[model samples]
Target: SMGNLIKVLTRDIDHNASHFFLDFENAQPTEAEREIFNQVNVVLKDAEGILNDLQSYRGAGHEIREAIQHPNDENLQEKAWSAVCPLVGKLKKFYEFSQRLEAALHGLLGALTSTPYSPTQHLEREQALAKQFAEILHFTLRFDELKMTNPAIQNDFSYYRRTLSRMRINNENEVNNELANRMSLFYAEATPMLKTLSDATTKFVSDNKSLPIENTTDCLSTMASVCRVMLETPEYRSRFASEETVSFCLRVMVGVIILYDHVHPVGAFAKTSKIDMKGCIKVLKDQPPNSVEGLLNALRYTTKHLNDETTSKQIKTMLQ
Candidate 1:
C-alpha cells in the first residue's frame, strides 16, 4: 500500500546527504567518534536487551515483520500488538540513542569533505543503522507466534565496540574486495572455460542456426533466478551438484522452453536438417522417476512444428 510506501522505498533510496570516509566497524575514530560509537554500542545493548525481553515474552516471534506480513488478519495483529504493549517504555530509549547515532552521522558528513568514498561510506552507516532498527521494529510490532516456548532471535550486528582499541579484521569485507580482484584474475584464468563454452555455443548455433539465441535475453536472464530457487528448495538441492552438467541440461531446457516462446519462421525444423532429444531423453530417462511422465511434463504446452530440421528430429525422436 502507498500508505506504507516507505517500507518499500527506504531501503533503495540514496542518502541525499553530504558525508565522509570513516569506517563504522572501527577505523581509528578520534576520541570523539569513539564516544559516539560507545553511545551506539550502548544503544545496541539496550535494544538487544529489549529484544531479549521481547523474546522472553511468552509466545512471541521475535520479529514484527514475520507477523506483519499477514496484517490483514485481525486475530494475528491483535496477538502481535499484545506483545508490543509490554515494551512501550524500553522502545523509547531507542529514540534517544538513535538521535545520538544521528549526531555521529552528521558529524561524519559535516567534518569530512570530498573524500573518495565518503558518499558510499556515509551511506553505509545509514544503511547499517536502518538494518538494526528494522530488525527491532520488525520484532517489536507483531501479534503472531504466541505458542512457541523458544522463539528464534536473529543476531545480525557486526563488530560493535565499547572502546575501540582497533577493530577486529573485517575478513568478510576484505574477502569481498579480494573476491572482486580474485574474480578478475579468475576471469583471466577463465579463458579456457569461456573459450570451451563459447566454442560449444558457436558450434551449436552455427550447426543449428535454428536454435540461435535472440538479441534480447531469456535463458541468461532467468538463470540467476532459477539457480537460487533450485538451491533454496531442499528437494531440488540434490538436483544441483554440478554446473557443467547443469549447463547441458539447461542448454536443452532452454531450447525446450524457448521453442514454446519463439516466432515460427519457415523451414525452422524439417527432414532436410535435424536435432535430437534422445540425449535429452536419456538424461531425463527412467532411474527413480517415470521417464514418460517427465517427458510429457516437459513437453506440455510446447510445439514440435516440423520443416525446421532441429525441431522435427526432436519431435520424431520422442515418437520412437
Candidate 2:
C-alpha cells in the first residue's frame, strides 16, 4: 500500500510540472510577483509545519500505546487515540486548504504570466491547474481508502517521516537553490509553445474591443462551447483524479493566483454599489470590456464577495 501510494504521489508530482509550467517560457516579472512569492511560500511553510505536527503525533501515539499496554490501562489507550484524532482532522483540513490555495494561485499566475493575454490563456491555465489539482485530490482519496482497510498503514506515524525528510532535502537543495537552473531547462523546451500563445493573445487583445467580447460575440460563444466540450470529456477529467497527483495542482494554483492579480487590479471593485455605473457605462461605450479599468471592474465584481465587507468597510473608513 505504501509503495502504491508513493507511486501515485510521484505520478501527480510529475503532472504538476506541465500544469504549472505552461507558457513559463515567456514569463516576466510582474507587479504581483512578490505577493505571489510571499503567499505561496507561506502556504508551503504552513503545510510543512502541519506535516511536522503529524509526525509528532505519531511519536506521541507510539509512546501512549506502549504505556497503555505495559500498564494495562484502557484509559491511557483511549486518551492516546483521542489525541491522534484531531491530528487526522487537521491533516484533512490541510489537504482542502492546499486545494483552494492551488486554485487561487493558478488563476493569478495564468492571468499575470501570459503575454498579450487573452481569455483562452485564462482557460488554458485554468484547465491545466484544475487537472493537476484533481490528481492530488485523487491521492488524498486513495490515502483515505488505504486507511480504512489497513489501520496500521494509515495510523503509522513513520509513514510520512521519511517522505518529509526527502521533501526537505529536495526543497533545500533542489527547488530553492536550483530554481533558476531548472527554469532555464524548462524555458528551452517550452519557448516555442509560449511564443505561439503570446502571439495569439497579443493579436486577440489588439483586435478585440472588449475583454469578454470583441467585434464578434461568436468568438466568445465558440470559446465557451470549447470549454464546455473539454469539461465533458473523460480525457480531461481523468488527468488529475488522484491525490498522488496534487503537487502539480499546488504549483498551478500558485500560478493562477499570480495571473489574476496581473490582469485585474486589486480593490478596484471593493464597493460596487458606490461605483458610478453611469460614468462606467459612458466609458464602457467608448472602450472595450477588456480595457484595463473595465476589466478590473468586471473582475472585481465577479470575484469579490460579501465577506470582503470587513476590508471594504475599513477602506471606506479610511476614505472618510
Candidate 3:
C-alpha cells in the first residue's frame, strides 16, 4: 500500500513542461507574454473565489472527516461533495496552469542552458515555483478521504497520514517540497521570456498603458509593497512565519492583492495584514540597503487575526 501510494503521489506531477510554459523561440513576443499574463490572471481570478469557499470546509476538515467516517450518511456525503466538488474544475484548470507554468519555465531558459538541473536566469522565480504547486498539492491530499468509503478504489494510492481525516495533511510533507524543487528548474533557462515581460511591465507602468509584454515586475513590485506595509504589524510577522523560498500560491496572491487593495473578506481571497500605507514605504525605504535579509525578513513576517476568523480566513485567502 505504501509503495503504491508513493508511486501515485510522485509519479505524474512533473511530466510535461508545456501546461505552464511558454515558448520564446517560436512564441510571439509581447503578445505571447501578454497571453501568459492574462491566462495566469484568469486562472487565479476564478480560482480565488472557489478556493475561498472550499477552504471553509476543507481547512478545518470537520465535515470531511464526518463524511468519510459515515459514508452511508447521504447527507454528510452530499455536503462533502458540495464542499469538495467545486475543486474538480479548478484542478482541470491547474492542469492547464501546470502546463503553461512548465512552458514559461522553458521559455525562461532561453539558451545558456548551461545550468541543466535548474533555471539560470532568475533563481528566485524558479525556486518560488515549488511553492506555487503547494496549494494544488495540498488540496490533492484531501482526496484521501475517499479511502474511508472505498479503501480499494479511492485511498488505494493515497498521499496522506491515515491517522487523521479532519487534518488532511501529507504523511510526508517532503513530497510537497520535492514537487517545489522540480517546479523551479527553469530559473536559469527562462530569461528572454520572463525578463522581457518583466522589463516591459516596468515600462508599461511608466507609460501607464497596457503592456504588450505585461509581465512579472508589477507583481514583484506589488509584493514588495505588501511586504513594506505588511511586515510592520506584529501579527503579520507571526502569520508570514516562514520565509518562503519557493511559494507558488503566494505569487498568484501577490498579483491579486496588488489589485484588490488591502482588504480580506471571509469569502474573498487571502487574509492580509491591515493596511498602513502611511508607514509602509517609509519603513521599506529605511531598511538597510544592499541586503536581501532585511527585505526578506520583512516579507517573511506572519499576520494578525480576530480569532480564527482572521487567521483561518487569512490562510485560506492567502492560498487563493
Candidate 4:
C-alpha cells in the first residue's frame, strides 16, 4: 500500500514524463552528459516549486491556527487542517526528495573530484554551495516549525533574537557604522509612520468618545508597510551581502516579526486591552541595541513593564 501510494502520488514525477527527474539521478560522463544535466535541471526547478507550495500552505495554516486559538475560538480548524494535511504529506515527500537529491549531487561531485577536474580549483565554489544549502536548511526548518504552530514561532523569535544579540556583542565590527546608521535612519522613518497612525487612532477615539477599537486590518496594513520598507530598502538589502549585516538584520527582523506577530491573534497580547502607552513602551524596550547583555536587559525590562500592576510601573521597570 505504501509503495502504491508512492507510485500514485509521484505519477507525474516520473523520469519519462519529466526529463528533469532523469537528470537529477543520472551522472554525466561527457559534454553531452553535462548538456543533459543542464536540460534536466528542470528537476531542481520542480523541487523548488514543491518547496514554495509547501511553504505557502504552512504559512496559511499558521495564520488560521492563530486566528482560532488566540480568541479561544473553534472556527476554521477543520478547513485549515484539511488544507494543511496534504501539505504536511507533501513536506514529508520533500524530505525524501532532498535526501535523494543530495545523494545524486554528492555522487556527481565524487565522480568529478576523481576525474581530470580540479577539486582544488573548485574549493571556493564547493564551499559556496555548502553555505547555500546550510542557509536553505536553516530556513526550511525554521519555517516548518513556524507554519505548524504559533508557539513555535514565538520560541523561534526569542531564540533568534538572543542568538543574534550574542553574536553582535562578541563582534564589535560585525556590523559597520554604515549599517547602524541605516538602522537609525530606518528608526527615524518609522517614527513618522507610527506618529501618523497614533494620531489617527487618537482622533478616532476622540470622535467616538471611546477607545479606538476596530478589526486588525488597519494595524496589520501599517505593520506590513513598515516591514516592506525595511526589507526593500537598498542599503538594508545590501547588508545581507555580509555575514555581519546578515546577523544584525536577523536580530532587527526578529523584533519586527515579533511586532507583526503581536498584531495577529496568536500573539501573547492578542486578547488584552487596546495597545496602551505601557504596551508601546514595552515594544521599545524589546528592541535590541545590537548587543547580547543589552538585549537580555531589554527583554527583562519589557516583561516587568507588562506584568507590573501599579500605575507607576513604567518608571519602576526602567533600567538604571
Winning candidate number (TM-score) = 4
Consecutive 10-residue window with the lowest summed lDDT within model 2: 189-198
| lDDT (tens digit, per residue) of candidate 1 on 182-256 | 333322221212222222333333443443343112222222223223323445535342433232233323232
Tell me the tens digit of each residue's lDDT in model 3 across 92-172. Answer: 333334444333432332221222332222222332232222222222222211212222212211212232242345313
Tens digit of per-residue lDDT, candidate 2, span 1-320: 32222222233344343223222223232444544444443444354344344344433447445644665565664565555445544544433454444444343333433545444443343333323323332322222222233343233323233323454585322122233333323222212112222233334444443444221122222232332222233464365334323323222221222122222223222332322223333322333333223222322332333235534544333222
Q: Mark the 10 consecutive residues where model 4 has the least summed lDDT.
A: 5-14
lDDT of each: 0.32, 0.34, 0.32, 0.34
TM-score of 2: 0.26
TM-score per model over all chains:
0.21, 0.26, 0.25, 0.28
Clashing pairs in 4: none
- lDDT at position 73, candidate 3: 80
In the order shown, the candidates' Cα RMSDs to the true structure are 24.2, 18.5, 19.5, 24.9
